[PDB]
């Protein structure tokens, strides 16, 4: 059930995705409709296992910010 999404930022540099760290995982909390995130089928409750090929379990906010807000982003999803 593991999938990969390969996302492209929109014209304003955004993806339309809200991620939440909750005990033992990073999860999708909100996907804006008609966004790059919604176009690759991300949904509430999806678990993000990898970001740009790195396992992201237990990442701090700083680490996520560095990786995600330092125009292709990849994520491994369960």
């Amino acid at each position: 059930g593991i999938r990969e999404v390969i996302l492209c930022k929109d014209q304003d540099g955004k993806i339309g995705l809200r991620l939440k760290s909750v005990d033992n995982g990073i999860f999708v909390q909100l996907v804006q409709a008609n966004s790059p995130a919604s176009l690759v089928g991300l949904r509430f409750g999806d678990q993000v296992l990898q970001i740009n090929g790195e396992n992201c379990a237990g990442w701090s906010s700083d680490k996520a910010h560095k990786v995600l807000k330092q125009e292709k982003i990849t994520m491994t999803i369960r």
Binding site: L17, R18, L19, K20, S21, A64, K69
Partner: peptide
């Protein structure tokens, strides 16, 4: 129990 980030 932890952070939120919008991307």
């Amino acid at each position: 129990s932890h952070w939120v980030x919008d991307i």
